[PDB]
Amino acid sequence: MKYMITSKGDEKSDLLRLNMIAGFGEYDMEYDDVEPEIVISIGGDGTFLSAFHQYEERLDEIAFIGIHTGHLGFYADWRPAEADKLVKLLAKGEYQKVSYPLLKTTVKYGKEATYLALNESTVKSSGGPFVVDVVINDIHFERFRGDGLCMSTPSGTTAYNKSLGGALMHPSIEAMQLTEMASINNRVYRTIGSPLVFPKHHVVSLQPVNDKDFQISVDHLSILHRDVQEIRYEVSAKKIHFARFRSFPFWRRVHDSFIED
Amino acid sequence: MKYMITSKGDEKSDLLRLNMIAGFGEYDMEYDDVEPEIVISIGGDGTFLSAFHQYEERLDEIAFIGIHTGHLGFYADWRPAEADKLVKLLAKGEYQKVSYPLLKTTVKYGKEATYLALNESTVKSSGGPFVVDVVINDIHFERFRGDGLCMSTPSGTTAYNKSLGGALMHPSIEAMQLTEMASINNRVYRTIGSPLVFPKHHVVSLQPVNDKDFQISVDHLSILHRDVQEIRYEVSAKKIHFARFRSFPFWRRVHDSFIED
Amino acid sequence: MKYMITSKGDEKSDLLRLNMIAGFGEYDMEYDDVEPEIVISIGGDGTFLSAFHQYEERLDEIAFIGIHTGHLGFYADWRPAEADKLVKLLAKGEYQKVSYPLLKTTVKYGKEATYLALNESTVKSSGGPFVVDVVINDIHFERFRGDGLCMSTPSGTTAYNKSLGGALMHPSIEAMQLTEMASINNRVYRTIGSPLVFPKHHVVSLQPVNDKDFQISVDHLSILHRDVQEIRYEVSAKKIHFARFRSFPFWRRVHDSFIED
Amino acid sequence: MKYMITSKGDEKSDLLRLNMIAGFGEYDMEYDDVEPEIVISIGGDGTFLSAFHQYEERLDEIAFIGIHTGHLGFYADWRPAEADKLVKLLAKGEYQKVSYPLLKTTVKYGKEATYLALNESTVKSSGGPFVVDVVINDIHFERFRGDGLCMSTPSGTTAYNKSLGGALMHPSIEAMQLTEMASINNRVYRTIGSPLVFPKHHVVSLQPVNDKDFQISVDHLSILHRDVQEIRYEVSAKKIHFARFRSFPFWRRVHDSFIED
């Protein structure tokens, strides 16, 4: 089986990578970073995001797995002391897989650009104010005036979505959640305020009102897009597959990351 | 087909009820409040809650429908001017049905009591403080100290769940959402703070820490339960069936109820 | 100088009290609980609240001081190991005093009752819903429909006021803060939502709309008042005087109580 | 008495300006934009901010007044129909003045820059993450990791400060309020979360942790500052003086702007 390993780049993560490579060398496993089948991230959830985004074209062929060299992450949720136990059961195979839904983000121009997000996708204003019309299934819902909006995946609800008052939902719920950023609500302007959770096949469209330029963000990426006609949010048809070798529940992961561990 | 009609009790709702009854009299429809098949609520969502709770034993045999004599409700979402058009297509039949998930609430004693909620179920403290341990799938999640907790259905997220900062989710998502009420978070006490959305078959259990008495609430009902051993929350296996005769989306209903109409 | 000591009642707080009494016995200090001049609370902020409320008629004659036998409190903010150092400088005198503003709460009937609050005063509903009209300086401000309201002192902003999203203000600011409890905001009902901070001489009046019965709360007290005509909130003309023997800033106290210590 | 008038620039605001100028021409009033004594803003609160900032060197010599050609503003709080009545009582004089506190913002480099804010001052991150240490009266309070912070004046609490969950305080309270922007709070990172209200002479200092570049904002201004050593917040010694010719309470202004009018 083909495999590759991504490291954060510091001292402990590079040394743990060369130890797993030497450990994989004692099995029929080829190190291939072009067309792998198991992608291992050593470092943190940020190191996991980069590993996901550089192989997002082969998502239905990869089983991801995360190793945190620092504090517990939600994707890098396996301690470095479990690496030598990890390489064996990965080499034998016969493991199980769990899948998390993804978020498709479409941007139209006066061309079209499609992105895939594991955590969330963000839209801010480029300098001046931020005003957009929110369309839900071709039905105008609200005129949002604030700092920006955030559409997050279920697994991304623990990330920047949480800091915006959003709710935490289990990654088995194939849905997406929209949150607001310092919305202006007065006697003339009105926003819903509450976060919105949309099921599959529900299309949330953002449409400009004046400025056609927005700082559009996808996970770690953040690019200023010019002359935007509409931004289209919906649950992606593609999923990310995790290699399941143990029982680490999602509410378990939330407990250790925010309550204490 | 058997039918019955519930009225709020005021002047306009009782007169609209006797007009539909006389309208149903021109078809093969029997007024039966014991074992109906179509239950019509005239008044508001509160009038709808009472109609749902007095027929919750026959939920898989009833198709509900709501008529609001006041402002737009989320279950009573049909104007009184559409009553004479409503009685016809209900009498002919051949309509469609939509189903919303429900919330089962189990209470154990040192006996057992099971309830069904359309909006939300609430747990408060009886006089003194409120302290409970939160268990998610037999895993202790947090020690909550505050005013209380609220577990709401998807359709109930627009109700009291919204006032507690909770998120609004589409009623097609078979799930439940837990929110907090003025939780105490200091350097020693710690709550998650964010709302939690649980999928089906996920059991959220509340367990006492000192006082075994709590003001347990289910929709409009609110009863003080004594010597409670645990409170068990989970998505109910039963659904509520609505008679669908027109296209009134859920995000449509949210727009007219909180943005403007 | 006359003095008295209040204890929480457990083992360590009663033993620390008898040690200070024996320590005070080596000076010209009389133990007098009728007309004291120094009131010492051993236990926590709750033990401090009881000591304040049983001597609220002599507030301009008492210098309070708090000793926490448990975690750091905001009024009981002196460790038990500093008791033997505390009794000396209190016996000699020549210390300094700091004063915190208080909250006067007036309730009218169809009689009148006036209370004094150190933390906050709370108004809830007795069974049914909670609807009141909010009057600010004889000007109607809003029709509040929710669970209740909370008017807190500056020193009380770290208490239940904090759990309701309210702001923390330094106790030198002679003011009061109003917060909301799960307010209903739709297309017809509208509340301000944000907390409100009122200066001195500003009178906030609550007026019923249907039910004239409310669960009125003052610090630990919580009494159901019948046939209430209006509730009147304003900054009290009386202050609580603390015995200052060391430098423990307020933002210091907030840091150790919510960040870490 | 010397005077000048600022207009938003559109059709109705320029025509109302030339009518007041012709109205002032019937009195002993000289139009002087260099060293005025009465500054009139025609348009909105944004038009008022520009008028305040271009005369902030002569704040103790100017009495400001605002005329809103659109919806009710908090500084432009006088309808255009009251202009001809406004010019007379301003020409006669013998009016009264009210003063609102201001916010001094100091920025040090490895030089120094001092700004004055009428609404709020904002600190964001330049590209990457935002991490600062919060110092209150030379005491480290917290390590803030989020989108940014906002320190607002009392009159500015109704502006961007309100959108961040902050409290609304009366402009007679000489203080300042700090709010957070999507703070990250986990098991290792910890922020206070609640807004903080600081009295006069209280110095809140922000200190970098990695990036020394921040998008610093003062009212409408927003400038990227390089190699910042610390940002210093405190209540300014200077006040802004309003020309009081009528009774328009602050809670009055809040009611008409957020409840309804």
Ligand SMILES: Nc1ncnc2c1nc(Br)n2CCCCBr
């Ligand atoms: N879903 C997430 N939950 C919690 N923390 C997250 C998440 N995504 C990212 Br990126 N982080 C921070 C990465 C840690 C530094 Br390598």
Ligand SMILES: Nc1ncnc2c1nc(Br)n2CCCCBr
């Ligand atoms: N899910 C709900 N969304 C909105 N309003 C609601 C809901 N449930 C109830 Br009860 N109300 C108030 C009933 C109106 C007075 Br008849």
Ligand SMILES: Nc1ncnc2c1nc(Br)n2CCCCBr
């Ligand atoms: N202002 C307050 N800040 C923080 N905690 C408080 C406050 N008032 C009270 Br009561 N508590 C709890 C008392 C501890 C158990 Br003896």
Ligand SMILES: Nc1ncnc2c1nc(Br)n2CCCCBr
């Ligand atoms: N303190 C403030 N309260 C409310 N609205 C405000 C405030 N400051 C400004 Br700028 N705006 C918007 C200006 C309107 C467009 Br000319």
